[PDB]
Amino acid sequence: MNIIAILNHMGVYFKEEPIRELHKALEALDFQIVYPNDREDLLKLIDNNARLCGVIFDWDTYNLDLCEEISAMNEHLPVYAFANTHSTLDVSLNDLRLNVEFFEYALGAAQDIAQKIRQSTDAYIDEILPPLTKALFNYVKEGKYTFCTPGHMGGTAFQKSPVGSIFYDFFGANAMKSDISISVGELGSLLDHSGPHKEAEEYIARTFNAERSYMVTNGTSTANKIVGMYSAPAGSTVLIDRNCHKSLTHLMMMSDITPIYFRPTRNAYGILGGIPKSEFQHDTIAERVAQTPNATWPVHAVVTNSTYDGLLYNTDYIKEALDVKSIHFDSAWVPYTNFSPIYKGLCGMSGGRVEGKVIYETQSTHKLLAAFSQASMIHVKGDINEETFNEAYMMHTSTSPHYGIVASTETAAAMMKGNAGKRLINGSIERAIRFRKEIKRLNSESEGWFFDVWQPEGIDEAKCWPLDSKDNWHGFKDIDNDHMYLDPIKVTLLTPGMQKDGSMADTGIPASIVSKYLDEHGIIVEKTGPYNMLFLFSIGIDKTKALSLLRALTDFKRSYDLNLRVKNMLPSLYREDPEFYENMRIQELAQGIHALIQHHNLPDLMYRAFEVLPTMVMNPHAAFQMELRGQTEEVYLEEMIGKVNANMILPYPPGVPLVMPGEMLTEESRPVLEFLQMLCEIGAHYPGFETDIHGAYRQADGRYTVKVIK
């Protein structure tokens, strides 16, 4: 934060000479000076360089409308106007609202003006930094000696070791110096919500539109467990989105809570849809309660919003219609919903208090904002017993939190404020929409096959596009209207191989091949389904990366159409079993995988296996407890029918839990088993494309076993 832009070349010595002296004095104060040629140049510099901490210009040449243009980009950026002919009578109230400091031209005044500019820069830095992060940085500047944990003592231990010194050089001194503990009393305590931490929490709650907020240093998995434990005592009944992250299943294995499942939808691609509106109704829930043994009226409900693939619920209807006192929106994938009006009504914290209810949002700050991994947030709107919640919170948080992760959470909040933060979010959305339109254009002008994008036909303006029953782009049958919306940030590209009616074509390109090719060429996809690839167009994606992705996709298409050899196209895959992949070409491998998928009818089996719910014989807690008592046996996959499962079976694809612990496959649930059996067969043909079934175990002979209650 040390770049100062000087805008003029004035042609009079009485201005130029003081400006040259000021240049020298500022450089003595450790500033880097840049010289834009004109106002458009300056505005571009500001747009492209966030380290620009100040602008100097001549008030005679440029009016204060230049300050208005600067402030529209960054309302806190200090601007220094040098006055010669203008006086106090030439400024208006609106002008005086801007962060402008006025100086005059004089020989010998460079030193005090530079001192004033240094003070203003420090004030700018202080204004944009959040309280905890500022306190941490100031403590580091103090350079105190520690005889307390952590044992590396501000990085000293690393410097005394060869390999430690390599680690220290990689991560840098500041990262080590800022790794501290609650022995440093001036920073307060996260667990006690004291000092700067308290301020941070309030800061976050204000930025994220929450009544209360909590920083979590072990991910949204831990955040979910905190919320669930506070909300669902033992013996209670909980409504669970069947498209729940396995953290919720872990919570159920930990606490003796009886689940009743919301049933979401799916399309032919295996992309998860939303829970239909009828599942939120009182009568449906009551009937399910009546049929479920040891079930009562639910005290807590958990809904995944958004889905992994970017489908958001209209949350106003859910908050109105779900007759449960506590509603928890697992919003891991959408921590940005408060920072753009296009998400209004599509997030848990949207709007005000719901009478008689408490709404939680759990957000993964590290997933789609800028924070270190494991940084997570809990947002609460509604009445809670603060002390009991604090107990549930401390039960899952370490007594030695990583201060860097905490500071990054606060800093993500700070990055979201003001004109600069609005530009960040809006720019990310606009970039995603431009990329989507470009994919559509390239697909249109492609002579043969090209990548498609999963979206409505005519996207024009930045918004969350509704899923409507008439349109068939989304592939969901008989979907409720004004219910599901697509987040433009989450871009799903489709490889050829599936027809528009839900069947698969004669030829196809499985998306795993494309993801491997992209990895070989320096591009990492978020995830890959059978014929879809997910790309996150977050605030960390710039034009360079998007254009590079387009170039990589066209390169893959050209290489595939030339039918290159796997040894050349995919060398790392070839290094897996070089004997198998000799003289094997790309089109043959792709067609073999596609024909294996088709012959086994993978889409129909995947769809049917997730449409029938396996029978719940005991809650996951009881089954897990019996597994802890060593009362389970490993049996083969063909014998699952009638056996109570001890473990969650989570297959990829589609990447969502298929069997929960305590559930039993009956005859009416046989397709589940068939699907799994199928995943075994297809997984045993091409190295590098192995089966991936959590909860199943590959034996030495190549068969698969599962653990069941003995």
Ligand X SMILES: Cc1ncc(COP(=O)(O)O)c(/C=N/N[C@@H](CCCCN)C(=O)O)c1O
- Which residue from 121, 178, 249, 376 is in contact with ligand X, where contact means CB under 6 A? 376
Tell the smallest beta-carbon distance from residue 574 to a copy of itself (Å): 11
Helix or strand or coil: residue 82? strand
Indicate the DSSP class of residue 37.
Answer: S
Q: Give which of a copy of itself, ligand X, none residue 577 binds (C-beta under 5 to 8 Å, depending on kind).
A: a copy of itself
In the bound state with ligand X, the residue whose beta carbon lies nearer, of 96 and 524, is 524
Tell the smallest beta-carbon distance from residue 378 to ligand X (Å): 12
Site for ligand X in 89-148 (CB under 6 A): none
Tell the smallest beta-carbon distance from residue 31 to ligand X (Å): 40
Contact (Cβ atoms closer than 8 angstroms) between residue 310 and residue 487: yes
In the bound state with a copy of itself, the residue whose beta carbon lies nearer, of 575 and 599, is 575
Question: Binding to a copy of itself by residue 457, rule CB under 8 A?
Answer: no
Tell the smallest beta-carbon distance from residue 224 to ligand X (Å): 6
- Which residue from 60, 526, 576, 604 is in contact with ligand X, where contact means CB under 6 A? 526
- Which residue from 206, 551, 575, 703 is in contact with a copy of itself, where contact means CB under 8 A? 575
Question: Binding to a copy of itself by residue 701, rule CB under 8 A?
Answer: no
Tell the smallest beta-carbon distance from residue 637 to ligand X (Å): 23
Tell the smallest beta-carbon distance from residue 520 to a copy of itself (Å): 18
Contact (Cβ atoms closer than 8 angstroms) between residue 59 and residue 39: no
Could you tell me which residues are beta bridge partners of residue 452? 494
In the bound state with a copy of itself, the residue whose beta carbon lies nearer, of 172 and 578, is 578
Contact region with a copy of itself (CB under 8 A), list: 161-169, 238-246, 501-509, 575-583: 575-583
- Which residue from 121, 213, 221, 647 is in contact with ligand X, where contact means CB under 6 A? 221
Question: Binding to a copy of itself by residue 211, rule CB under 8 A?
Answer: no
706/658 Cα distance (integer angstroms)? 13
Q: Give which of ligand X, a copy of itself, none residue 376 binds (C-beta under 5 to 8 Å, depending on kind).
A: ligand X
Q: Give which of ligand X, a copy of itself, none residue 575 binds (C-beta under 5 to 8 Å, depending on kind).
A: a copy of itself
What is the dihedral sign for C-alpha 462, 463, 464, 466? negative
Q: Specify the amino acid at residue 662.
A: G
- Which residue from 577, 611, 638, 639 is in contact with a copy of itself, where contact means CB under 8 A? 577
- Which residue from 332, 453, 467, 513 is in contact with ligand X, where contact means CB under 6 A? 332
Q: Give which of a copy of itself, ligand X, none residue 537 binds (C-beta under 5 to 8 Å, depending on kind).
A: none
Count of residues that interact with ligand X, criterion CB under 6 A? 13
Torsion, CA 440, CA 441, CA 447, CA 453, rounded to 10: -10
Helix or strand or coil: residue 258? strand
Contact region with ligand X (CB under 6 A), list: 80-88, 218-226, 505-513, 600-608: 218-226
Q: b/e for 460-472, b at 16 or more Cβ within 10 A?
A: eeebbbbbbeeee
Tell the smallest beta-carbon distance from residue 240 to ligand X (Å): 12
Question: Binding to a copy of itself by residue 576, rule CB under 8 A?
Answer: yes
Tell the smallest beta-carbon distance from residue 560 to a copy of itself (Å): 26
454/436 Cα distance (integer angstroms)? 9
Residue 256 has a CB neighbour count (10 Å cut-off) of 17
Contact (Cβ atoms closer than 8 angstroms) between residue 66 and residue 41: no
Block residue for tokens 């199928």: 678
Residue 610 has a CB neighbour count (10 Å cut-off) of 24
Contact (Cβ atoms closer than 8 angstroms) between residue 204 and residue 213: yes
Contact region with a copy of itself (CB under 8 A), list: 313-321, 378-386, 455-463, 570-578: 570-578
Helix or strand or coil: residue 282? helix
In the bound state with ligand X, the residue whose beta carbon lies nearer, of 241 and 279, is 241
266/527 Cα distance (integer angstroms)? 17
Tell the smallest beta-carbon distance from residue 24 to ligand X (Å): 50
Q: Specify the amino acid at residue 676.
A: L
Cis peptide before 653 (omega within 30 of 0): yes
28/37 Cα distance (integer angstroms)? 24
Block residue for tokens 């296009």: 342
Tell the smallest beta-carbon distance from residue 483 to ligand X (Å): 19
257/252 Cα distance (integer angstroms)? 6
In the bound state with ligand X, the residue whose beta carbon lies nearer, of 265 and 376, is 376
Question: Binding to ligand X by residue 411, rule CB under 6 A?
Answer: no
Tell the smallest beta-carbon distance from residue 216 to ligand X (Å): 9
- Which residue from 130, 154, 219, 620 is in contact with ligand X, where contact means CB under 6 A? 219
Helix (H) or strand (E) holding 483: none
In the bound state with ligand X, the residue whose beta carbon lies nearer, of 4 and 275, is 275
Contact (Cβ atoms closer than 8 angstroms) between residue 702 and residue 660: no
Could you tell me which residues are beta bridge partners of residue 534? 492, 527
Question: Binding to ligand X by residue 304, rule CB under 6 A?
Answer: yes
Q: Give which of a copy of itself, ligand X, none residue 576 binds (C-beta under 5 to 8 Å, depending on kind).
A: a copy of itself
Which residues have a Cβ under 8 Å from the Cβ of 506 and sit 6 or more positions away? none
In the bound state with ligand X, the residue whose beta carbon lies nearer, of 221 and 632, is 221
In the bound state with a copy of itself, the residue whose beta carbon lies nearer, of 320 and 690, is 690
- Which residue from 171, 578, 685, 699 is in contact with a copy of itself, where contact means CB under 8 A? 578
Tell the smallest beta-carbon distance from residue 676 to ligand X (Å): 19
Count of residues that interact with a copy of itself, criterion CB under 8 A? 5
Residue 107 has a CB neighbour count (10 Å cut-off) of 10
Residue among 404, 432, 428, 406 nearest 416 (CA): 428
Contact region with a copy of itself (CB under 8 A), list: 192-200, 368-376, 577-585, 621-629: 577-585
Q: Report residue 497: phi and psi, to 5°.
A: 145, -10
Question: Binding to a copy of itself by residue 579, rule CB under 8 A?
Answer: yes
Q: Specify the amino acid at residue 74.
A: N
Contact (Cβ atoms closer than 8 angstroms) between residue 529 and residue 510: no
> In terms of DSSP H, where are the helices of 562-639?
566-569, 571-575, 586-599, 602-609, 620-628
Contact (Cβ atoms closer than 8 angstroms) between residue 407 and residue 366: no
Q: Angle at CA 499, nearest 5°, toward 494 and 501? A: 120
Question: Binding to ligand X by residue 452, rule CB under 6 A?
Answer: no
Contact region with a copy of itself (CB under 8 A), list: 162-170, 283-291, 576-584, 606-614: 576-584
Residue among 417, 219, 255 nearest 332 (CA): 219
The footprint of a copy of itself (CB under 8 A) covers 575-579
The footprint of ligand X (CB under 6 A) covers 219-221, 224, 245, 247, 304, 308, 330, 332, 364, 376, 526
